[PDB]
Amino acid sequence: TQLTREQVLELFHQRSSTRYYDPTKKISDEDFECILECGRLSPSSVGSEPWKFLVIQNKTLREKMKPFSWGMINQLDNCSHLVVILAKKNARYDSPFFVDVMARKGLNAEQQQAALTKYKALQEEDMKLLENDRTLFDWCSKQTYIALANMLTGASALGIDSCPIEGFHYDKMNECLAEEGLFDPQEYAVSVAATFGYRSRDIAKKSRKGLDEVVKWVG
Amino acid sequence: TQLTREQVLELFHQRSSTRYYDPTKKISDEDFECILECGRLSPSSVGSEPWKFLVIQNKTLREKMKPFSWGMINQLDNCSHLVVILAKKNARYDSPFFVDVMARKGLNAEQQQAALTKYKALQEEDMKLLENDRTLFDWCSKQTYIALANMLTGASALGIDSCPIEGFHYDKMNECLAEEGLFDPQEYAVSVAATFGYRSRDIAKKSRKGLDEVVKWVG
Ligand SMILES: Cc1cc2nc3c(=O)[nH]c(=O)nc-3n(C[C@H](O)[C@H](O)[C@H](O)COP(=O)(O)O)c2cc1C
Ligand SMILES: Cc1cc2nc3c(=O)[nH]c(=O)nc-3n(C[C@H](O)[C@H](O)[C@H](O)COP(=O)(O)O)c2cc1C
Ligand SMILES: O=C(O)c1cccnc1
Ligand SMILES: O=C(O)c1cccnc1
């Protein structure tokens, strides 16, 4: 709730990508539930929350991923928890998906038509998202990277290590998960994944570009 | 550095999108540098770190933004600080950008050709990023939304309010900032923005989907 600049900086400095997990250690259900809340409570463009969190504790499913998940093949067997994040497909301003968005905010027929023209201008004019399906999906997939970032940070504040994962064949992971009946492949598609647990090895040297190279002040 | 579940949960409940800032309150330079570090230290796919943070404190430049920034119109006049986050364009596995990435990790000719083979498979086969410029750019822009999320959360743990911003004409924001010579428009393009300051109104309550609607457990 309140931290000092030296605790805040250390909290973001201390989080590291953990590629080797201790299979003997596992996260508590209350610890992981608060990690998932970090995700659920994340902000998202126009309150869209275009995400779904699949928690893959089934061990037969983890083994089936191994062949096309080179980024986490040596993490799938030992991590305590695995999360695959999906992003909403085709979240157009006039889609049922956005009727639910407006409905969660209690919008009358007039409030909805004003919000609808705002969504349209955002998607069609401001960001040019309705050229094809991939650009619109990537917009919701961007929001899911917000939830991903917050789950990593919330985990690291609870002493739990993590690794974000993109190292897998999207097409094969999509098919494997949709054929296992875990989501409707016309409404959602995989966006990014993440492992959680406790490090087995040591945490390496934090390496990033300098602050003076990545910031330009405009005064 | 270490928080309890009540503190972590409260940290993500307390962060809210602030549309109304107190113009008499400014964030100190030391507080704002610690917010910028939160972004700099964020994880990124293959350590790409594909972001640049523009801090727009010039009030003439802010005023030039108001006509096409409906999402931020009143925030531009009262927020303490404004950050426009750029994402790298054309970040192909065989680009100079990725020679810099490999160079910061110190790889020899053998390690660079092995890593280049992994970047190739990741970008071309696994994620299908190389079918046009937009898909490759949107990959880096997803990374920058991680940096965005960490800046919002790091700011709120310091007691500083914020609001992520997508509500603006992107084409016109790219042009306006490139005409001030702030980046090379063939190397970078605007990804997302954020305002920071101290709110003038109180936090309204979280409205999110339930944990039971957005989490699917597979045991
Ligand atoms: C990427 C992104 C862009 C956003 N753009 C704007 C914006 O332009 N203007 C605005 O007022 N709010 C914007 N929001 C704020 C969201 O509406 C807000 O996150 C959501 O309604 C949830 O509220 P909370 O953030 O207050 O929890 C944006 C949020 C995100 C994540
Ligand atoms: C979106 C995303 C995907 C990532 N994918 C993988 C991955 O598949 N496998 C992996 O080992 N690390 C992956 N990483 C970890 C990064 O390589 C790591 O974050 C970065 O190099 C910085 O190191 P640090 O996080 O330990 O500081 C990923 C990171 C991000 C952000
Ligand atoms: O998220 C919002 O509420 C929002 C986004 C863009 C423009 N106006 C509002
Ligand atoms: O970020 C990495 O280190 C990474 C990303 C994808 C696949 N393997 C490694």
Compute the distance between CA of residue A30 and CA of residue B4 in angstroms, rounded to an integer.
11
Q: Give dist(CA A17, CA A19) in Å, integer.
A: 6
Measured CA to CA, the distance from residue A139 to residue B138 in angstroms comes to 8
- Percent of chain A that is helix, strand, coil (3-state, to 5): 45, 15, 35
Per the CATH hierarchy, to which homologous superfamily does domain B5-197 belong?
NADH Oxidase (3.40.109.10)
Per the CB < 8 A criterion, the answer to whether A36 and B211 are in contact is yes
Is CATH 3.30.420.40 what the domain over A5-213 is classified as, yes or no? Answer: no
Assign A159 to helix, strand or coil.
coil
Which residues 121-160 of chain A have a CB within 8 Å of chain B? 121-122, 125-128, 134-135, 138, 141-143, 145-150, 152-154, 157-159
B17 contacts A10? CB cut-off 8 A? no
Asked if A197 and A160 count as a contact pair (C-beta separation under 8 A), the reply is: yes
Buried/exposed B73-101: b ≥16 CB within 10 Å, e otherwise: eebbebbbbbbbbbbbbebebeeebbeeb
Q: Which residue has the tokens 């009262």?
A: B78
How far is it, in rounded angstroms, from Cα B162 to Cα B153? 9
B154 is in an annotated binding site: yes
Distance from C-alpha of B165 to C-alpha of B70, rounded to nearest angstrom:
10
For residue A155, what are the CA distances in angstroms to A20, A51, A181?
A: 16, 19, 28
- Give residue A118 CA to ligand 3 midpoint distance, Å: 8
Please list every residue in chain B whose beta carbon sits closer than 8 Å to the beta carbon of residue A59: none
Of B121, B140, B21, B154, nearest to B81 by C-alpha is B21
To what resolution in angstroms was this structure determined? Answer: 2.3
Sheet with A188-197: list strands edge to edge: A161-165, A188-197, A81-88, A51-56, B215-218
Q: How far is B145 from chain A (nearest CA, A)?
A: 6
Taking CB atoms and an 8 Å cutoff, what residues of chain B touch A157? 1-3, 7-8, 11
| Residue A188 φ/ψ, nearest 5 degrees | -145, 160
Cross-chain Cβ contact A10/B2 below 8 Å: no
Q: Using only the alpha carbons of chain B, give its radius of gyration.
A: 19
Integer-rounded Cα radius of gyration of chain A = 19
Q: Which of B34, B71, B56 is nearest to B150 (CA)?
A: B34
Cα A140 to ligand 3 centroid, rounded to whole Å: 14
Residue A10 and residue B2 in contact, taking contact as beta carbons nearer than 8 Å? no
- Angle (CA) A58 B146 A177, round 5°: 25
CA distance B211 to B219: 17
Q: Domains of chain A: which residue ranges? A: 5-213
- Do residues A157 and A63 make contact, with C-beta atoms less than 8 angstroms apart? no
| A205 touches B: beta carbon within 8 Å | no
Strands (E), A76-210: 81-88, 161-165, 188-197
> Could you tell me how many residues make up chain B?
219
